[PDB]
Design an enzyme around this catalytic site. Structure first.
Site, PDB file in Angstrom:
ATOM      1  N   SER A  45       0.795  -1.227   0.000  1.00  0.00           N
ATOM      2  CA  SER A  45       0.000   0.000   0.000  1.00  0.00           C
ATOM      3  C   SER A  45       0.821   1.267   0.000  1.00  0.00           C
ATOM      4  O   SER A  45       0.289   2.364  -0.116  1.00  0.00           O
ATOM      5  CB  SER A  45      -1.044  -0.019   1.088  1.00  0.00           C
ATOM      6  OG  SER A  45      -2.155  -0.861   0.839  1.00  0.00           O
ATOM      7  N   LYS A  48       0.383   4.036  -2.649  1.00  0.00           N
ATOM      8  CA  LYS A  48      -0.729   5.011  -2.653  1.00  0.00           C
ATOM      9  C   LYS A  48      -0.272   6.438  -2.568  1.00  0.00           C
ATOM     10  O   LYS A  48      -0.920   7.338  -3.058  1.00  0.00           O
ATOM     11  CB  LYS A  48      -1.760   4.613  -1.637  1.00  0.00           C
ATOM     12  CG  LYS A  48      -2.508   3.307  -2.025  1.00  0.00           C
ATOM     13  CD  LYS A  48      -3.191   2.594  -0.894  1.00  0.00           C
ATOM     14  CE  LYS A  48      -3.904   1.319  -1.361  1.00  0.00           C
ATOM     15  NZ  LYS A  48      -4.298   0.371  -0.264  1.00  0.00           N
ATOM     16  N   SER A 105      -5.657   3.483   3.894  1.00  0.00           N
ATOM     17  CA  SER A 105      -5.244   2.435   2.973  1.00  0.00           C
ATOM     18  C   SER A 105      -6.364   1.890   2.124  1.00  0.00           C
ATOM     19  O   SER A 105      -6.298   0.768   1.662  1.00  0.00           O
ATOM     20  CB  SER A 105      -4.538   1.244   3.676  1.00  0.00           C
ATOM     21  OG  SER A 105      -3.253   1.686   4.108  1.00  0.00           O
ATOM     22  N   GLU A 141      -5.296  -3.119  -6.739  1.00  0.00           N
ATOM     23  CA  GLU A 141      -5.602  -3.706  -5.431  1.00  0.00           C
ATOM     24  C   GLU A 141      -6.803  -4.632  -5.551  1.00  0.00           C
ATOM     25  O   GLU A 141      -7.728  -4.355  -6.326  1.00  0.00           O
ATOM     26  CB  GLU A 141      -5.925  -2.622  -4.439  1.00  0.00           C
ATOM     27  CG  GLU A 141      -4.767  -1.784  -3.950  1.00  0.00           C
ATOM     28  CD  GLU A 141      -3.848  -2.482  -2.995  1.00  0.00           C
ATOM     29  OE1 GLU A 141      -3.975  -3.723  -2.776  1.00  0.00           O
ATOM     30  OE2 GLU A 141      -3.025  -1.724  -2.372  1.00  0.00           O
ATOM     31  N   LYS A 209       3.186   6.367   5.515  1.00  0.00           N
ATOM     32  CA  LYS A 209       2.308   5.497   4.766  1.00  0.00           C
ATOM     33  C   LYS A 209       2.799   4.060   4.933  1.00  0.00           C
ATOM     34  O   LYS A 209       3.951   3.795   4.576  1.00  0.00           O
ATOM     35  CB  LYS A 209       2.203   5.860   3.285  1.00  0.00           C
ATOM     36  CG  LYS A 209       1.290   4.923   2.491  1.00  0.00           C
ATOM     37  CD  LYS A 209      -0.165   5.297   2.622  1.00  0.00           C
ATOM     38  CE  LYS A 209      -1.124   4.138   2.353  1.00  0.00           C
ATOM     39  NZ  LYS A 209      -1.106   3.142   3.461  1.00  0.00           N
ATOM     40  N   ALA A 212       0.980  -3.668   3.812  1.00  0.00           N
ATOM     41  CA  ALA A 212       1.000  -5.042   4.281  1.00  0.00           C
ATOM     42  C   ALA A 212       0.560  -5.939   3.155  1.00  0.00           C
ATOM     43  O   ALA A 212      -0.402  -5.641   2.411  1.00  0.00           O
ATOM     44  CB  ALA A 212       0.040  -5.261   5.488  1.00  0.00           C
TER      45      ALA A 212
HETATM   46  B1  LIG Z   1      -1.998  -2.463   0.781  1.00  0.00           B
HETATM   47  O1  LIG Z   1      -0.900  -2.780   1.696  1.00  0.00           O
HETATM   48  O2  LIG Z   1      -1.592  -2.711  -0.616  1.00  0.00           O
HETATM   49  C1  LIG Z   1      -3.408  -3.046   1.076  1.00  0.00           C
HETATM   50  C2  LIG Z   1      -4.307  -2.606   2.253  1.00  0.00           C
HETATM   51  C3  LIG Z   1      -3.671  -2.770   3.637  1.00  0.00           C
HETATM   52  C4  LIG Z   1      -2.857  -1.771   4.127  1.00  0.00           C
HETATM   53  C5  LIG Z   1      -2.230  -1.886   5.363  1.00  0.00           C
HETATM   54  C6  LIG Z   1      -1.392  -0.798   5.911  1.00  0.00           C
HETATM   55  O3  LIG Z   1      -0.640  -0.979   6.885  1.00  0.00           O
HETATM   56  O4  LIG Z   1      -1.488   0.298   5.335  1.00  0.00           O
HETATM   57  C7  LIG Z   1      -2.459  -2.992   6.143  1.00  0.00           C
HETATM   58  C8  LIG Z   1      -3.282  -3.997   5.656  1.00  0.00           C
HETATM   59  C9  LIG Z   1      -3.910  -3.892   4.390  1.00  0.00           C
HETATM   60  N1  LIG Z   1      -3.186  -4.518   1.233  1.00  0.00           N
HETATM   61  C10 LIG Z   1      -4.034  -5.490   0.869  1.00  0.00           C
HETATM   62  O5  LIG Z   1      -5.138  -5.306   0.324  1.00  0.00           O
HETATM   63  C11 LIG Z   1      -3.523  -6.918   1.116  1.00  0.00           C
HETATM   64  N2  LIG Z   1      -4.212  -7.848   0.183  1.00  0.00           N
HETATM   65  C12 LIG Z   1      -3.819  -7.307   2.496  1.00  0.00           C
HETATM   66  C13 LIG Z   1      -5.099  -7.686   2.784  1.00  0.00           C
HETATM   67  C14 LIG Z   1      -5.364  -8.101   4.120  1.00  0.00           C
HETATM   68  C15 LIG Z   1      -4.395  -8.107   5.107  1.00  0.00           C
HETATM   69  C16 LIG Z   1      -3.162  -7.728   4.794  1.00  0.00           C
HETATM   70  C17 LIG Z   1      -2.849  -7.399   3.503  1.00  0.00           C
END
Ligand SMILES: *[B]([O])([O])[C]([C]C1=[C]C(C([O])=O)=[C][C]=[C]1)[N]C(=O)[C]([N])C1=[C][C]=[C][C]=[C]1
Ligand SMILES: [Ca+2]
Length: 263
Positions: A45, A48, A105, A141, A209, A212
């Site tokens: 993320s 972004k 996010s 995403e 930012k 995960a």
């Molecule tokens: B992103 O990291 O691309 C996105 C959304 C997300 C962001 C964060 C953060 O710390 O900003 C934490 C968790 C999720 N990631 C996802 O969509 C990814 N598939 C995901 C989904 C669920 C749990 C973790 C990662």
């Protein structure tokens, strides 16, 4: 309280996979210290911010307005869309979408904004056009970083990301108003409490930012410093492990504590 590089190396010992780290001086852009600076990591993320940099560049070019309202439908929603899912009737402005993508996010918000610029390959073209020939976005995403590991797709390096973030936040690449809007959204981040923010002393500034994947990967980009003004950029990525989210978070927080205690 271990030295930062010692702590980064220990984090990698404990987690498996790789941990990448860089700290830049914001004023000069000089690398202060680093570990795996030129190796690829999934952006997750963290992309972004770069996306909203591209949006703001279009604003500055007279091609977009932060106040423009975007309507969308239930079929546009993807996983991890806490803000966009509540605005199916009213829609959201471009600026609201960036706020949601950065601060929460929100994934649908990011996908909507990607549509505004023509998709992931156009974000890559934007990065290329600001002199970053390393960073690449290829996916939307949420599949970003979840569909079979680093083909270089959807990756950056600590130095490429830190350099590119510095150019967006300090360069005359963006207008002063747009640079400020970008850092303001990062300062307003709501979902990175467990990370660098957990180590931050009172009075300090942070604009960040996080990112995960479900398994294996975590990351954060940040501009931070004492006395209410950012003075350094920090980028931390980790990938390739089977560590838990708690473990990953803990290690980023401990790297943060080291870099603050040895500032
Ligand atoms: B992103 O990291 O691309 C996105 C959304 C997300 C962001 C964060 C953060 O710390 O900003 C934490 C968790 C999720 N990631 C996802 O969509 C990814 N598939 C995901 C989904 C669920 C749990 C973790 C990662
Ligand atoms: Ca090692």
């Amino acid at each position: 309280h271990p030295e930062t590089l010692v702590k980064v190396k220990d984090a990698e010992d404990q987690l498996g996979g790789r941990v990448g780290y860089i700290e830049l001086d914001l004023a000069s852009g000089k690398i202060l210290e680093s570990f795996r600076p030129e190796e690829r990591f999934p952006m997750m993320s963290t992309f972004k911010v770069l996306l909203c940099g591209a949006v703001l560049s279009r604003v500055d070019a007279g091609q977009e307005q932060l106040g423009r309202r975007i309507h969308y439908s239930q079929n546009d929603l993807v996983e991890y869309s806490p803000v966009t899912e509540k605005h199916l009737t009213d829609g959201m402005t471009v600026g609201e979408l960036c706020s949601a993508a950065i601060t929460m996010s929100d994934n649908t918000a990011a996908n909507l904004l990607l549509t505004t610029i023509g998709g992931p390959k156009e974000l890559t073209a934007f990065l290329h056009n600001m002199g970053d020939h390393v960073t690449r976005l290829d996916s939307w995403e949420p599949e970003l970083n979840e569909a079979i590991p680093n083909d270089e797709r959807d990756t950056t390096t600590p130095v490429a990301m830190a350099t590119t973030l510095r150019k967006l936040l300090t360069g005359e690449l963006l207008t002063a108003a747009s640079r400020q809007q970008l850092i303001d959204w990062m300062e307003a981040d709501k979902v990175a409490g467990p990370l660098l923010r957990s180590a931050l002393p009172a009075g300090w500034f942070i604009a960040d930012k996080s990112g995960a994947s479900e398994r294996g990967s975590r990351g954060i980009i940040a501009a931070l410093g004492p006395d209410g003004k950012p003075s350094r950029i920090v980028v931390i990525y980790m990938t390739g492990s089977q560590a838990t989210m708690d473990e990953r978070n803990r290690q980023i927080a401990e790297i943060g504590a080291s870099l603050i205690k040895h500032w």
